[PDB]
Amino acid sequence: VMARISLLGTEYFEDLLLHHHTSTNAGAADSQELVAEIREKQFHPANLP
Amino acid sequence: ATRPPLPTLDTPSWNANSAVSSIIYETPAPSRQPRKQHVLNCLVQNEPGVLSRVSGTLAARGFNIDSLVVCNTEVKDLSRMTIVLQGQDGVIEQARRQIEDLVPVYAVLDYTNSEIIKRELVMARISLLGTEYFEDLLLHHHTSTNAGAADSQELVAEIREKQFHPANLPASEVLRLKHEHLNDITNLTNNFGGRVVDISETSCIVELSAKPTRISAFLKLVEPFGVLECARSGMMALPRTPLKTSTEEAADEDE
Amino acid sequence: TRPPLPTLDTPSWNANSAVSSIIYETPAPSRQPRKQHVLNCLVQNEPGVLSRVSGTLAARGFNIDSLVVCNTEVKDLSRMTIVLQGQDGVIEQARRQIEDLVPVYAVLDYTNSEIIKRELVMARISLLGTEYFEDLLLHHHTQELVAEIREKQFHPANLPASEVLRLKHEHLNDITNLTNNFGGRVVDISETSCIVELSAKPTRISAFLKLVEPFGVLECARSGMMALPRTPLKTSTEEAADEDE
Amino acid sequence: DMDTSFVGLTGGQIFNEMMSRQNVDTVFGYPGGAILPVYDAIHNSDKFNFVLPKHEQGAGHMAEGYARASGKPGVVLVTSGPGATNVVTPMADAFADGIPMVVFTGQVPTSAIGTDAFQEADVVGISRSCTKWNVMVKSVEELPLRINEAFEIATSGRPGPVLVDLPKDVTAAILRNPIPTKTTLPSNALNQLTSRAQDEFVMQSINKAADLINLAKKPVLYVGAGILNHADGPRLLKELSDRAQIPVTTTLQGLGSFDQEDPKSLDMLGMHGCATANLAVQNADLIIAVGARFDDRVTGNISKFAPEARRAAAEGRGGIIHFEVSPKNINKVVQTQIAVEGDATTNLGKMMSKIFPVKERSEWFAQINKWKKEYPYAYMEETPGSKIKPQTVIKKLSKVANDTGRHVIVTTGVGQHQMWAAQHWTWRNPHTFITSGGLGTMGYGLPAAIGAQVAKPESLVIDIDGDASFNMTLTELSSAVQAGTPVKILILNNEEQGMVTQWQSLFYEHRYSHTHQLNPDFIKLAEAMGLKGLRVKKQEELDAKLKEFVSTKGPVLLEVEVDKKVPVLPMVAGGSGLDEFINFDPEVERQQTELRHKRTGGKH
Amino acid sequence: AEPDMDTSFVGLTGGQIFNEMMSRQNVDTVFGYPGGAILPVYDAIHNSDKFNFVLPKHEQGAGHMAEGYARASGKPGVVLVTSGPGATNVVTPMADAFADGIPMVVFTGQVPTSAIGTDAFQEADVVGISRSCTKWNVMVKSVEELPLRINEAFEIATSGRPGPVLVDLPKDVTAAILRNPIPTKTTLPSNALNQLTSRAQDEFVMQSINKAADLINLAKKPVLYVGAGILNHADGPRLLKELSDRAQIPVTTTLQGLGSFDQEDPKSLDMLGMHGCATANLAVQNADLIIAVGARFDDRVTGNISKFAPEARRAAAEGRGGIIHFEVSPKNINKVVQTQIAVEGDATTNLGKMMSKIFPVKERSEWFAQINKWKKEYPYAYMEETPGSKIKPQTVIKKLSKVANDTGRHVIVTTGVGQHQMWAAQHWTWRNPHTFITSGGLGTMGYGLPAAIGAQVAKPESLVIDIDGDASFNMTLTELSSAVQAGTPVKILILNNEEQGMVTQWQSLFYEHRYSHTHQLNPDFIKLAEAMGLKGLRVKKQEELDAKLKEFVSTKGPVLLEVEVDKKVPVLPMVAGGSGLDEFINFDPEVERQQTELRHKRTGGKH
Ligand SMILES: Cc1cc2nc3c(=O)[nH]c(=O)nc-3n(C[C@H](O)[C@H](O)[C@H](O)COP(=O)(O)OP(=O)(O)OC[C@H]3O[C@@H](n4cnc5c(N)ncnc54)[C@H](O)[C@@H]3O)c2cc1C
Ligand SMILES: Cc1cc2nc3c(=O)[nH]c(=O)nc-3n(C[C@H](O)[C@H](O)[C@H](O)COP(=O)(O)OP(=O)(O)OC[C@H]3O[C@@H](n4cnc5c(N)ncnc54)[C@H](O)[C@@H]3O)c2cc1C
Ligand SMILES: Nc1ncnc2c1ncn2[C@@H]1O[C@H](COP(=O)(O)OP(=O)(O)OP(=O)(O)O)[C@@H](O)[C@H]1O
Ligand SMILES: Nc1ncnc2c1ncn2[C@@H]1O[C@H](COP(=O)(O)OP(=O)(O)OP(=O)(O)O)[C@@H](O)[C@H]1O
Ligand SMILES: COC(=O)c1ccccc1CS(=O)(=O)NC(=O)Nc1nc(OC)cc(OC)n1
Ligand SMILES: COC(=O)c1ccccc1CS(=O)(=O)NC(=O)Nc1nc(OC)cc(OC)n1
Ligand SMILES: Cc1ncc(C[n+]2csc(CCOP(=O)(O)OP(=O)(O)O)c2C)c(N)n1
Numbered sequence A: 001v002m003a004r005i006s007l008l009g010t011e012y013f014e015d016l017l018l019h020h021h022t023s024t025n026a027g028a029a030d031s032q033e034l035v036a037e038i039r040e041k042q043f044h045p046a047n048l049p
Numbered sequence B: 001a002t003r004p005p006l007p008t009l010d011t012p013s014w015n016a017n018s019a020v021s022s023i024i025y026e027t028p029a030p031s032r033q034p035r036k037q038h039v040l041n042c043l044v045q046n047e048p049g050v051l052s053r054v055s056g057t058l059a060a061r062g063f064n065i066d067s068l069v070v071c072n073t074e075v076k077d078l079s080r081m082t083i084v085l086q087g088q089d090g091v092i093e094q095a096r097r098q099i100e101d102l103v104p105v106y107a108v109l110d111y112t113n114s115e116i117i118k119r120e121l122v123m124a125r126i127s128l129l130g131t132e133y134f135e136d137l138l139l140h141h142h143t144s145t146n147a148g149a150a151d152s153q154e155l156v157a158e159i160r161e162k163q164f165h166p167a168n169l170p171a172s173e174v175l176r177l178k179h180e181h182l183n184d185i186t187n188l189t190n191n192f193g194g195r196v197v198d199i200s201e202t203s204c205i206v207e208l209s210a211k212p213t214r215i216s217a218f219l220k221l222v223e224p225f226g227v228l229e230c231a232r233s234g235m236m237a238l239p240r241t242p243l244k245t246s247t248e249e250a251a252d253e254d255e
Numbered sequence C: 001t002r003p004p005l006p007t008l009d010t011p012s013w014n015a016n017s018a019v020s021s022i023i024y025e026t027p028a029p030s031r032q033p034r035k036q037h038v039l040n041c042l043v044q045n046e047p048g049v050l051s052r053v054s055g056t057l058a059a060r061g062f063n064i065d066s067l068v069v070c071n072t073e074v075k076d077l078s079r080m081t082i083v084l085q086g087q088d089g090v091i092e093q094a095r096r097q098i099e100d101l102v103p104v105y106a107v108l109d110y111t112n113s114e115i116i117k118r119e120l121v122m123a124r125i126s127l128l129g130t131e132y133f134e135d136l137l138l139h140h141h142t143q144e145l146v147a148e149i150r151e152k153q154f155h156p157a158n159l160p161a162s163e164v165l166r167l168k169h170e171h172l173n174d175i176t177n178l179t180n181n182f183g184g185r186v187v188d189i190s191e192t193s194c195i196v197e198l199s200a201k202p203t204r205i206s207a208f209l210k211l212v213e214p215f216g217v218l219e220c221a222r223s224g225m226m227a228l229p230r231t232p233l234k235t236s237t238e239e240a241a242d243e244d245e
Numbered sequence D: 001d002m003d004t005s006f007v008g009l010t011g012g013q014i015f016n017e018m019m020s021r022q023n024v025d026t027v028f029g030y031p032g033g034a035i036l037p038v039y040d041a042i043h044n045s046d047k048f049n050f051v052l053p054k055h056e057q058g059a060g061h062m063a064e065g066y067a068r069a070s071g072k073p074g075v076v077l078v079t080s081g082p083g084a085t086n087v088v089t090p091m092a093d094a095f096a097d098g099i100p101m102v103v104f105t106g107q108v109p110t111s112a113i114g115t116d117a118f119q120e121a122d123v124v125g126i127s128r129s130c131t132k133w134n135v136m137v138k139s140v141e142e143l144p145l146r147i148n149e150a151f152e153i154a155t156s157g158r159p160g161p162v163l164v165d166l167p168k169d170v171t172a173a174i175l176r177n178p179i180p181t182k183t184t185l186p187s188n189a190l191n192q193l194t195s196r197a198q199d200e201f202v203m204q205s206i207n208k209a210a211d212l213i214n215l216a217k218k219p220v221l222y223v224g225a226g227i228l229n230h231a232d233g234p235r236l237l238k239e240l241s242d243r244a245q246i247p248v249t250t251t252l253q254g255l256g257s258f259d260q261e262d263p264k265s266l267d268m269l270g271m272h273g274c275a276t277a278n279l280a281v282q283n284a285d286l287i288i289a290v291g292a293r294f295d296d297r298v299t300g301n302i303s304k305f306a307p308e309a310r311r312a313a314a315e316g317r318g319g320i321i322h323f324e325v326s327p328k329n330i331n332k333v334v335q336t337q338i339a340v341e342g343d344a345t346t347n348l349g350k351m352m353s354k355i356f357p358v359k360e361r362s363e364w365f366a367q368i369n370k371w372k373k374e375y376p377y378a379y380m381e382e383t384p385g386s387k388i389k390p391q392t393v394i395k396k397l398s399k400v401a402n403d404t405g406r407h408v409i410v411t412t413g414v415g416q417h418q419m420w421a422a423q424h425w426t427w428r429n430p431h432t433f434i435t436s437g438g439l440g441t442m443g444y445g446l447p448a449a450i451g452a453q454v455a456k457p458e459s460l461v462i463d464i465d466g467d468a469s470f471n472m473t474l475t476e477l478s479s480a481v482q483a484g485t486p487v488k489i490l491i492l493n494n495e496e497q498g499m500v501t502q503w504q505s506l507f508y509e510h511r512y513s514h515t516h517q518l519n520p521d522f523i524k525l526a527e528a529m530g531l532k533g534l535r536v537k538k539q540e541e542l543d544a545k546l547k548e549f550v551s552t553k554g555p556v557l558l559e560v561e562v563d564k565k566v567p568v569l570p571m572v573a574g575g576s577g578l579d580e581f582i583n584f585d586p587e588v589e590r591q592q593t594e595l596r597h598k599r600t601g602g603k604h
Numbered sequence E: 001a002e003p004d005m006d007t008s009f010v011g012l013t014g015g016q017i018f019n020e021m022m023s024r025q026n027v028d029t030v031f032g033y034p035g036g037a038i039l040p041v042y043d044a045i046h047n048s049d050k051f052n053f054v055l056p057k058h059e060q061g062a063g064h065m066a067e068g069y070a071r072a073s074g075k076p077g078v079v080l081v082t083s084g085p086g087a088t089n090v091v092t093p094m095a096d097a098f099a100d101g102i103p104m105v106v107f108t109g110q111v112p113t114s115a116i117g118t119d120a121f122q123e124a125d126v127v128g129i130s131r132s133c134t135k136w137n138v139m140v141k142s143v144e145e146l147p148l149r150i151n152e153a154f155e156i157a158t159s160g161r162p163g164p165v166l167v168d169l170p171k172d173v174t175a176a177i178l179r180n181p182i183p184t185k186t187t188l189p190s191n192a193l194n195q196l197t198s199r200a201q202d203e204f205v206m207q208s209i210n211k212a213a214d215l216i217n218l219a220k221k222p223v224l225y226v227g228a229g230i231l232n233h234a235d236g237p238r239l240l241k242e243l244s245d246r247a248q249i250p251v252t253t254t255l256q257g258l259g260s261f262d263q264e265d266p267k268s269l270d271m272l273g274m275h276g277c278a279t280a281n282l283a284v285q286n287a288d289l290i291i292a293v294g295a296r297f298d299d300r301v302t303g304n305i306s307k308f309a310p311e312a313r314r315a316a317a318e319g320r321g322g323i324i325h326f327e328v329s330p331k332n333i334n335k336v337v338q339t340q341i342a343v344e345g346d347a348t349t350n351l352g353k354m355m356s357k358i359f360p361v362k363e364r365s366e367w368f369a370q371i372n373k374w375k376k377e378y379p380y381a382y383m384e385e386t387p388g389s390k391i392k393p394q395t396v397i398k399k400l401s402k403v404a405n406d407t408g409r410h411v412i413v414t415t416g417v418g419q420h421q422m423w424a425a426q427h428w429t430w431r432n433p434h435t436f437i438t439s440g441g442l443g444t445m446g447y448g449l450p451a452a453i454g455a456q457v458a459k460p461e462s463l464v465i466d467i468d469g470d471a472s473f474n475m476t477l478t479e480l481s482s483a484v485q486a487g488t489p490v491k492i493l494i495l496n497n498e499e500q501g502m503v504t505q506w507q508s509l510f511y512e513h514r515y516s517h518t519h520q521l522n523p524d525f526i527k528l529a530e531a532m533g534l535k536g537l538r539v540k541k542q543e544e545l546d547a548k549l550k551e552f553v554s555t556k557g558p559v560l561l562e563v564e565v566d567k568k569v570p571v572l573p574m575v576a577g578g579s580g581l582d583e584f585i586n587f588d589p590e591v592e593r594q595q596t597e598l599r600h601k602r603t604g605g606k607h
């Protein structure tokens, strides 16, 4: 087995999946309260120094 | 939709000037210590009173002996003593001739200016509770000599009200900090080629054997954790022969 | 057909001979027993001291197996680890004899406590084998037996330079494996010898020195014994469930 | 988003509803013991018409004639076992010519699959090599989805055959759950944001193409069947050919896309193509490939294919431009210089604006008309008291059918009669020439004629067939009567396998090895099937027969006794390039006629 | 290399090697159709005196003709066609011969090796296409491998259970000239396993024979379930007679097992299965021991697998009976039904190796009581002719059976697929081996005429009758002219019911007489036969049946006979659906009259 594993934690990975899921599902700006909820989480990189 | 954001660190880079300015600034100082210490090796016949006779001679002549250790070889009635001195060559050579003249000794060799393997042994008990607790623990035993109370309250209260003092930390976080400190010390002693021989709820014992200049650096790096108890040997040595390639030793330009 | 293979045919024990082996090999004591006692002295680092404690113990005919002065990382404070043997009341006299000395803070008895006793040993140890070692000892011992030694099969003489080279490294490996098992290390390797280092119990140090003895020990140096008590901890469930009171 | 309009229906009944949803109006098939649930559902179905052949291979070939003449997918509904393996050849034929076809084959129950069941064949494993995509419907819930996927794949990109296996228990099962019908194609799911970057790539490819065309001085339009897969195909091809004055040569399957009564027509390319087209290609500085895949029958010797194009490419003044719908066929045979991925017709419209109008190409057309008036389709014409020539029959019928004023569709078999029907027939209308080129299956003429007649019931469908090819599938002669198809079967009976005998006369010292089959009484045969039989073996009888043949109100067969051992010329074979053709010469034929009689002992 | 090297082919082209290989493999006849990619081969076999050649009008004919040759002669049927369309037309015969176990070696042409995978002219993935419907296939990459692959092809096609193999021949390979010595002796991977485990396997099968004979001697109601496997050996049928006479065991046969047992014998149970007689079906269900000899328990034979052989199955749980399977391939052992005793290898060989272990029996009164009771209570019944009625199909077979028999000729019967196929199997008395050639495994329509032609080539002086159906005949009737060119005096009988009988029967019984596209437009067969160059005879009235049948057989040369038979007549008995063999649907004179009036009501008088 060979697997590339993220080091930015669960928050970023939860963010990463949502970005690539809304790129194949619909072109509309859906799931607004999901990207905003995943972000502004305590241990999301964007909220840490 | 936007890609998941990341706060870019952007680590600053050196330029040619500030880099050189850094290296020059971080330069030490040459000859900050005087003449290198001298190491003597005594071959003494193992008869009752030799340790008192040798060490008694150096004390009777005021020789500044840094360390003296007697080692038992695997030969019947034969011991080896390693002595470290300080001073000029003329004074230390005299010390050699003064010991060698003694009856129960065979010969006293001079290991200075010679390739030897200097060794030393240290065993230290290190606190796992951290810096704040070590200030509390050490100051507590000092009051058993200082005979002060009302004045020392300014210190101990200041210490126990610090952030990472065990009294102010939950029982679960103190546990992690014990093993975090343990992992730091273990990684620190492993790099020095040492061992962790004892582990307890509040402390650990490390064991290291190396040259004095290596151990002193070790005990300085472990110092911030708090050394509760230390046992550091003198210094023993075993002569080494510097190997050189057949091409390097062929350079016999003694013309 | 048959691909030939030699049958080793390893024999097996029975219930009787197996017991007969265990009974035969199991260790045994000897006449006039002896036990080890350990003392720990906390002394002030004044001029003398080393001559004082050693002199006091020698002027009273104590056994004294080692002394070993250890430096605490504290200003003007030394530490000594005295190894003794004799009856419990005899070595107790020695303890009170040293504690009476004015630079000695106290003398602690570690003989009845879980402690860590370590000893440093540095040996040179030849790589050329037993035959050369017998030659080297007899050479410095200052005939016919000299010729017989140099006529042995595995002396460096009458033996190809290639096999000597391999026997050097073969011995080097066998020594290395011993040092590794005992938790030591090879710090130096020459063309004829290899300096080894080991810090362990004196009962283990002598065990290592006995095992590497056939390889021929050129030089040797044993520090003595350094002692530091384990931080009091052994059982978890018997801490309060002792009910000894 | 779950469909629920099929709940309560059986798999066969769902199949019947899917046909109307796919705008299917005709189904070619043959019953069986595993496809019974489907046939029971389509019984007297007013949603589409049914055509019953005598052989499954017929159904497959009828579906192709239907597809190529209508542009709609050919639907085949056969059973399992032998019923499925009999449609392999027309599937392989459609897979080569790129013909839209959806073949529904029956299958043993899912409970018996893998037990060497009765009439069980690995139809998926067999048809895999000759279909764009196949599938075995695992459950009735997946059936509307699979059918939707089948029709989409069969008509997307380059058209082709797809196979859908229908287990007995699946078609009999009643749907009792909501189902997904939305297709989830992987290659289609690639288009998330890649569509933009790719749409820019093709547009920039158009720019480079338009620049190279304007720079060309001796350009040649190399046109294939890809320009016919769009309604505005032939229309835009003419618009560009008039704008830049570029001559047009077509492949065998490209015939009909360009008016051959146009001065810029170069006629057919390739092995049996005229010298005018071949020399034009070999001496062109720029080749514009529109809907063609550079077949080995076309390029001849690949080493010598268009030296002037390659030389111009190395000097940055020409080369080869390729308009292809699927990147698979780009840079597969010849190294193109500019690749225009996508629909050829669609891209020709986007490029049309960037093309500089050319008044005239004097010295280029002067050299073309020189070749054109120096290398015709010359052949040994009839003499007083001679046998009827095959090329002449094509000539006369091409005018007789043209004088009818009816829309004429022509289907052929495989061989000499096929080539002569492509050379000497004048093509002006698109989708009027339906022949098996890619795989070249014999017995293709009659069923494709029947199928095309179903697609275009008003058209005059003429089958220019050969005697050996007709014997392959003449069983469908009775199918034409039952289908009500007034097809016109023309047999150029040379009492031999001309295409093989020609290669044996040229390359094997006139050694005819089992290339002479025993033909039946085609006139007695035709009337036994329910048709009218006509025969002509005299020159002064031909023109009257060709008119009675065409003006016959219903299915009819006309056998024309033609001259034997007549080679198709010109011929580019072996290691010869397109410019190294073998042209016709009266003395050469007259000599080998004498040489053959000696080697065959007067037999042939 | 260390194996043997042959130099006999040095200087010959690939095609000229092929010509020699046919004589080295003892080939009498090659069925094929010339083409472009196969031209070098055809050029080399030009007027070859090593074998005859039969030219069909379609490649599917060539395949089916080759099958008829193999079923009759016992020799591998060779097919030589071209690439592309010629190779895709032999898929159905290959798929058919793959299921019925018929030895074929299909030689397909191929585009030059330098054009493989270039979407070349007349190029097809013939190896990939035929991979599932062949025993093994290969594309000859070089002239050096050509004689090796051919020998591998013929060996595989005849080893174990016979089957079809495909050899793809690129044009440049058959045209190139061999210049170096080459290996020829085959080394199959399957033979490397048998060579290593020879002694162990040969003892394992003997141990099974011992246990088999013990169970056979223990049986009290045994039944010999005989298939097509016993026909793949010359001494097959005779050892079957010997085993059946020695222990007094009744013999039932499959469709492809017909001819392996004399049906004049009192121990003959005749055909069993879906349209098998009730006597054989009930015997199988009530037997305590089933001895499967050369059969594979087809789903048309066992009917409902769950209800198959209840007594034989429970006898196995008591250690007094069960099922014994004589197979050549382990693939077909414990695949459909669980077997208590498996005997691997050639059935005939094992039977002749078990004769010395079977206890002689003379009388089974209790067991033959039910058998002879069933024979009288459940015969092949049908609505026989009445004064002023259409000719019945079953009657024609019965009459032709005795007419052909009263000639003294060796009669070979081939059929199509449908109702006529079953009636020709039911009402024809089979005594001689390799005399019944039909498509059962795959059931291919249009099999009758070409198989008859190919069988006629194998047996020139034999009476070859094709009992075909009108729909089946309308699949490959193009081969009528091929019969004339091949000089085969085949006898064609078309039981014309103007319908797809077998499909209409299922529609009449299971789909409420909803006839969907099961009535094709037949042509004038008499005018057809004469147009093809044959003799045509038609029988409409019932009276002319006997007089025309005699003329049909007495006629020297190929002749076609059309018999207008009654329509919408179901083949009975019938075991279908979840019905077991003992749950057959037998004939009923009242029911047929009831179904007749109901059919007229729903079809509006059209049927
Ligand atoms: C006996 C015989 C002799 C023959 N000799 C000749 C001969 O001399 N000359 C000759 O020309 N042919 C000849 N052929 C036929 C030849 O084998 C090929 O079938 C022929 O080259 C096919 O024409 P094509 O490549 O242009 O069309 P296709 O084979 O159908 O290829 C069409 C190409 O265009 C692409 N395409 C399809 N649709 C579109 C679209 N909508 N937009 C863009 N691109 C698309 C396809 O992907 C494909 O690559 C002969 C056939 C036979 C049986
Ligand atoms: C419309 C129709 C209806 C049918 N209904 C019936 C029916 O009612 N009854 C019926 O019996 N058939 C019927 N069939 C045919 C049926 O589907 C099978 O084809 C038939 O069962 C095949 O007979 P078989 O299994 O004995 O022979 P095969 O299918 O050829 O099986 C031979 C088996 O014996 C083994 N074998 C082969 N050679 C040897 C050897 N030399 N030694 C040992 N073992 C060997 C093989 O491995 C194989 O397992 C029908 C067919 C059609 C088209
Ligand atoms: N608090 C502890 N109690 C018991 N064992 C410990 C403790 N802490 C560590 N150890 C284990 O003891 C080991 C050190 O023992 P060592 O390997 O030196 O054998 P030893 O010198 O013979 O000791 P001893 O004489 O007590 O048996 C550590 O490596 C560690 O695995
Ligand atoms: N004959 C040799 N000469 C030099 N180095 C050696 C020789 N043999 C081994 N070494 C290397 O020297 C290493 C000893 O490392 P050590 O920790 O003792 O360095 P040190 O304490 O700073 O002593 P020194 O100042 O002599 O280098 C051995 O592990 C080995 O890698
Ligand atoms: C065709 O049958 C199957 O696909 C099959 C194969 C293996 C196991 C089961 C089946 C389904 S079935 O036993 O129920 N037969 C069937 O549905 N139709 C059916 N129609 C017949 O006449 C056209 C004749 C006939 O076999 C003699 N079977
Ligand atoms: C069938 O050709 C090939 O197998 C082939 C395919 C791809 C590339 C090369 C070849 C060999 S070939 O170009 O030399 N043609 C050939 O051998 N025979 C040949 N016979 C014809 O009449 C029966 C007609 C005909 O194509 C019009 N080709
Ligand atoms: C099924 C099939 N088999 C073989 C071939 C090879 N082949 C191509 S043309 C031909 C002979 C047919 O000649 P014919 O159909 O009579 O037309 P002709 O050239 O004689 O006018 C053959 C055998 C083929 N294309 N298809």
Ligand SMILES: Cc1ncc(C[n+]2csc(CCOP(=O)(O)OP(=O)(O)O)c2C)c(N)n1
Pocket: D030, D031, D032, D033, D056, D079, D082, D083, D086, E416, E417, E418, E419, E420, E421, E442, E443, E444, E445, E468, E469, E470, E471, E472, E473, E495, E497, E499, E500, E501, E502, E503
């Ligand atoms: C190629 C092929 N297609 C379909 C079938 C299914 N099938 C089996 S019998 C039959 C009808 C043929 O009836 P017929 O040949 O006229 O004989 P009949 O039952 O009428 O006596 C069909 C379509 C088949 N066996 N083979």
Ligand SMILES: [Mg+2]
Pocket: none
């Ligand atoms: Mg221990």
Ligand SMILES: [Mg+2]
Pocket: D415, D417, D466, D467, D468, D469, D492, D493, D494, D495, D496, D497, D498
């Ligand atoms: Mg012809």
Ligand SMILES: [Mg+2]
Pocket: E418, E469, E470, E471, E495, E496, E497, E498, E499, E500, E501
């Ligand atoms: Mg019929």
